[PDB]
Design a protein around this ligand. Structure first.
Ligand SMILES: [Mg+2]
Ligand SMILES: [Mg+2]
Ligand SMILES: [Mg+2]
Ligand SMILES: [Mg+2]
Ligand SMILES: [Mg+2]
Ligand SMILES: [Mg+2]
Ligand SMILES: [Mg+2]
Ligand SMILES: [Mg+2]
Ligand SMILES: [Mg+2]
Ligand SMILES: [Mg+2]
Ligand SMILES: [Mg+2]
Ligand SMILES: [Mg+2]
Ligand SMILES: [Mg+2]
Ligand SMILES: [Mg+2]
Ligand SMILES: [Mg+2]
Ligand SMILES: [Mg+2]
Ligand SMILES: [Mg+2]
Ligand SMILES: [Mg+2]
Ligand SMILES: [Mg+2]
Ligand SMILES: [Mg+2]
Ligand SMILES: [Mg+2]
Ligand SMILES: [Mg+2]
Ligand SMILES: [Mg+2]
Ligand SMILES: [Mg+2]
Ligand SMILES: [Mg+2]
Ligand SMILES: [Mg+2]
Ligand SMILES: [Mg+2]
Ligand SMILES: [Mg+2]
Ligand SMILES: [Mg+2]
Ligand SMILES: [Mg+2]
Ligand SMILES: [Mg+2]
Ligand SMILES: [Mg+2]
Ligand SMILES: [Mg+2]
Ligand SMILES: [Mg+2]
Ligand SMILES: [Mg+2]
Ligand SMILES: [Mg+2]
Ligand SMILES: [Mg+2]
Ligand SMILES: [Mg+2]
Ligand SMILES: [Mg+2]
Ligand SMILES: [Mg+2]
Ligand SMILES: [Mg+2]
Ligand SMILES: [Mg+2]
Ligand SMILES: [Mg+2]
Ligand SMILES: [Mg+2]
Ligand SMILES: [Mg+2]
Ligand SMILES: [Mg+2]
Ligand SMILES: [Mg+2]
Ligand SMILES: [Mg+2]
Ligand SMILES: [Mg+2]
Ligand SMILES: [Mg+2]
Lengths: 92, 49, 246, 61
RNA sequence: GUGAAACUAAGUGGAGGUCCGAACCGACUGAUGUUGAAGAAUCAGCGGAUGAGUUGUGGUUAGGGGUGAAAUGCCACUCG
RNA sequence: CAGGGCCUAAGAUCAGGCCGAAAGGCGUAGUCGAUGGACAACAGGUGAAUAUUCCUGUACUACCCCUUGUUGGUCCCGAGGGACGGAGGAGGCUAGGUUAGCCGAAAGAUGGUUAUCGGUUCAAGGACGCAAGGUGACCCGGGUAAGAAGGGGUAGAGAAAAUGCCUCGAGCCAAUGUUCGAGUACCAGGCGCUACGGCGCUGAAGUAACCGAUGCCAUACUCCCAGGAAAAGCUCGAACGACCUUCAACAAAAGGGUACCUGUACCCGAAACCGACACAGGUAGGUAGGUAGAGAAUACCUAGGGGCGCGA
RNA sequence: GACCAGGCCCGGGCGACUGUUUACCAAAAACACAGGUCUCCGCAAAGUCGUAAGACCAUGUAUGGGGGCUGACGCCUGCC
RNA sequence: UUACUGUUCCCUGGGAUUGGCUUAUUCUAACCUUGUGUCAGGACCUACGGGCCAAGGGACAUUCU
């Protein structure tokens, strides 16, 4: 019942990434890029996106940068579309 | 009467024989993986070297 | 097989501090520890010999015992033993080799080994290869006997012991052909003090092959090396001694 | 095939060096607790040079 | 072969701090270098190379000390 | 995949306890501690910089749900097992290599010539199963009664185990191999485009023999003395004690669903580590081609990487 | 036929031999060595390290352990 | 080092720890040693140890002065 750690769930997602490679990844993989907290997990991020936008998450992959900042690859299920969700935010 | 024992004995050995070879196969994978030479995609590139 | 284990005191020669107390110990081949039964409890049951195994932790062989209750034990190997011989530990046991019993029920002039000095601690004396202790006499409370050193000690009567002589008597006959056989046992090279420097040993200095140059030979710690008896005066076991070895 | 005489630092792993010069090692003995007292009054930035975490980019494994 | 042994001829067997010789570990001679490419190396030969062998990783022994197949040698280019 | 969430050695700490001007020292269970044990994945493709990590295809492990059955279980505890040396050589296989065949292309201004050039490839895993290999009592091929692997039963402090007794059982052991995976996928070559990058179609044949491992069967066998870790996972099972419970727990097949933390860049027989240098040096381990050769020596070459950071 | 790839013989001294040693001027005739001898120790052992508790020796028991000298083997090892 | 002055290991005596009956020897109750003997908590201590009961020594020795 307990999570791994305890902190602000609304801080798990700071902001997305806007790069020519990231935008290229949305159309090919149906994925999304998000900078995340260092203390975050794949479970909290999976639960997070399920609540904000109301969409299913096929898989989550993460990594820690050299600067101590964690990044999160989020692949949505094929039923939904990351490009459609992208336009809802404002970024293409 | 005796066919029941002989018939069940072979099935009892086949399952153990089946699991025993699977055991020796995975340990062979764990062995050469520690050596660092298991993936054949990496070995065929280093066949002539 | 279950009596063998690898839990031993690694780091031979080194104490808790980690300094060398017993010198010239190190190297050597690895060896597991065998659990030998010296108390010889579980009395009044027969047990036969099946194997005659090699014990690296001693000079003598051992013998595996199989009792009717399924238990298994190790014991020393007597001299004329053969596979199939039985052994018993008790009081009214017949006086033959391999059996164990107190000294009260033994006759005079018996070949004895695996003697205990106190009840419960188990046998401590006459363990080595070809060892034997001859019972001279007994008188009331205690019983005197002879040891392999030739000394006549006075042991209590209620102490247990095993009959016969220890196996593999012919072990001194082989000479270690070379130095490598010595290092296999875990015995490092012995250096002579007369070659050292004066700071290391009292015999050190001097050009050429120096003589002793001292009133007597001395240990590395100053005391003499010959003649000085090291037995503690007024020891607790001083009355149990009949004479000195020779 | 012999290393020169001055090679006293053979690039040993940081895991072992932390077990010999790390923060937890100093706080065990009384001298190490006084060692840090000297380096704090000195005002040194890095109190223990030979230390690493159990995880992250610094982890030796 | 003998009364039985001792002894003795072949074959099998593949022992050894065995032999030659790379890696690996060592460093006997000479040259070169000697404000060196290098605070001990390069070049040409040399020794051991199944053993008392070599080596990694992780540890132990700390100075009126430790360690030393013992040179007063080594113990962070520092050791009477 | 590697490490942790599992185990333990060396060794370090140590509840209490013992000792001691202080600091503290010794020390029991216990806990930390990989250099070990245990535990589930491959091929191909994509490509400014990453992929056994992303995509495709085919698998595996754990947990949960579902469907029946069972209906006391789960720890503690007992036992088995894990569990191990060196040397030596023989045998059976494969990797790999060579040649041949097949397919395609080729005229490389010379005296002659195609004898030339290139390709001939594919894993983890699932299912089946093996000798003329090794092993297993009986004879000089046959016969025969015990006997192997692997099971069952029984007595005693006595569930399992151990010990003893009785009994069934000619077959067992595993690298390799067959088949699916495995598609006109991959591929030489050819047809067209160009900013010359590659793109887009097309895409034949895809076999055999010999040599043969330092690798696999293999802690297989033989010999020898120096006599060759531990714990957990796993498996079997009573009593005592503890916790929980009619499913809310154990157990079996299929199907379906779900899937923690850290490392992952780059150099690594080095210009990036260690040597104060972009230093003729040192740096564990893995992969091991062709000709000659006993050979991983040596000489010349392939893949691939280089022409040594002042020159004339 | 290249590269690669043992020079040998007679005699003597020391040490038996394989090995180890002064990292950076000494690899030896020095050290070690198997063996031999003397002496100590009967286990709560001697010895060794500690203020002490205690540890090693040893989970060993006089065919074993510690210490001194000598140093394969062969002939010997005298007198006070 | 058979230089001077000292320290330590070790040996010995007096005193404390330390007691009883006899003519120095014995006795057991202090003290020393041992137990895979036994009991013990939620459980274990066959993991040191603790309590109890035994065994061997015994007023010696260890320790302090
Ligand atoms: Mg990751
Ligand atoms: Mg090659
Ligand atoms: Mg000298
Ligand atoms: Mg002196
Ligand atoms: Mg002298
Ligand atoms: Mg002289
Ligand atoms: Mg090297
Ligand atoms: Mg040799
Ligand atoms: Mg050689
Ligand atoms: Mg050297
Ligand atoms: Mg050279
Ligand atoms: Mg050489
Ligand atoms: Mg030579
Ligand atoms: Mg030689
Ligand atoms: Mg220190
Ligand atoms: Mg000082
Ligand atoms: Mg130095
Ligand atoms: Mg893994
Ligand atoms: Mg405490
Ligand atoms: Mg402990
Ligand atoms: Mg643990
Ligand atoms: Mg590991
Ligand atoms: Mg894991
Ligand atoms: Mg790259
Ligand atoms: Mg076992
Ligand atoms: Mg032509
Ligand atoms: Mg039973
Ligand atoms: Mg990567
Ligand atoms: Mg990489
Ligand atoms: Mg390397
Ligand atoms: Mg280099
Ligand atoms: Mg330099
Ligand atoms: Mg070659
Ligand atoms: Mg070469
Ligand atoms: Mg060339
Ligand atoms: Mg140039
Ligand atoms: Mg340069
Ligand atoms: Mg240059
Ligand atoms: Mg030569
Ligand atoms: Mg002369
Ligand atoms: Mg010599
Ligand atoms: Mg030599
Ligand atoms: Mg020198
Ligand atoms: Mg030499
Ligand atoms: Mg020299
Ligand atoms: Mg020397
Ligand atoms: Mg003692
Ligand atoms: Mg000499
Ligand atoms: Mg008790
Ligand atoms: Mg107890």
């Amino acid at each position: 019942k307990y999570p791994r750690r305890i902190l602000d769930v609304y801080q798990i997602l700071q902001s997305p990434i806007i790069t020519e490679a990231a935008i290229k990844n949305i159309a090919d993989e149906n994925s999304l890029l998000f900078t995340v907290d260092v203390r975050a997990d794949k479970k909290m991020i999976r639960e997070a996106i399920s609540n904000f936008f109301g969409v299913k998450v096929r898989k989550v992959n993460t990594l820690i940068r050299p600067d101590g900042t964690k990044k999160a690859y989020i692949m949505l299920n094929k039923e939904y579309n990351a490009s459609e969700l992208a336009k809802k935010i404002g970024i293409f | 009467s005796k066919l029941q024992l002989k018939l069940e004995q072979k099935i009892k050995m086949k399952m153990a024989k089946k699991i025993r070879l699977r055991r020796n196969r995975l340990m062979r994978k764990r062995k050469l993986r520690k050596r660092g030479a298991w993936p054949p995609s990496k070995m065929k590139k280093l066949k002539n070297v | 097989n279950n009596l063998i284990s690898g839990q031993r005191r690694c780091g031979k020669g080194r104490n808790a501090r980690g300094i060398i107390t017993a010198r010239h110990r190190g190297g050597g081949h690895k060896r597991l520890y065998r659990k030998i039964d010296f108390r010889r409890n579980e009395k009044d049951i027969y047990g036969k010999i099946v194997t005659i195994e090699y014990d690296p932790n001693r000079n003598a062989y051992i013998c595996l015992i199989h009792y009717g209750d399924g238990e298994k034990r190790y014991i020393l190997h007597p001299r004329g033993a053969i596979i199939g011989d039985t052994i018993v530990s008790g009081t009214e046991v017949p006086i033959k080799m391999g059996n164990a019993l107190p000294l009260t029920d033994m006759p005079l002039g018996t070949a004895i080994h695996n003697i205990e000095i106190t009840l419960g601690r188990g046998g401590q004396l006459a363990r080595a290869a070809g060892a034997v202790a001859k019972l001279i006499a007994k008188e009331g409370k205690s019983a005197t006997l002879k040891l392999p050193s030739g000394e006549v000690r006075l042991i209590s009567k209620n102490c247990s012991a095993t009959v016969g002589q220890v196996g593999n008597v012919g072990v001194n006959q082989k000479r270690l052909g070379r130095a490598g056989s010595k290092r296999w046992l875990g015995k490092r090279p012995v250096v002579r003090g007369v070659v050292m420097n004066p700071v290391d040993h009292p015999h050190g200095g001097g050009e050429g092959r120096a003589p002793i140059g001292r009133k007597s030979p001395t240990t590395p710690w100053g005391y003499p090396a010959l003649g000085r008896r090291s037995r503690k005066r007024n020891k607790y076991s001083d009355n149990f001694i009949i004479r000195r070895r020779s | 095939g012999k290393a020169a005489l001055c090679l006293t630092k053979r690039s040993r792993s940081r895991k072992s060096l932390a077990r010999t010069h790390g923060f937890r090692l100093r706080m065990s003995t009384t001298s190490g607790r006084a060692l840090l007292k000297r380096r704090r009054a000195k005002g040194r930035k890095i109190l223990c040079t030979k230390t690493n975490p159990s995880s992250g980019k610094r982890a030796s494994p």
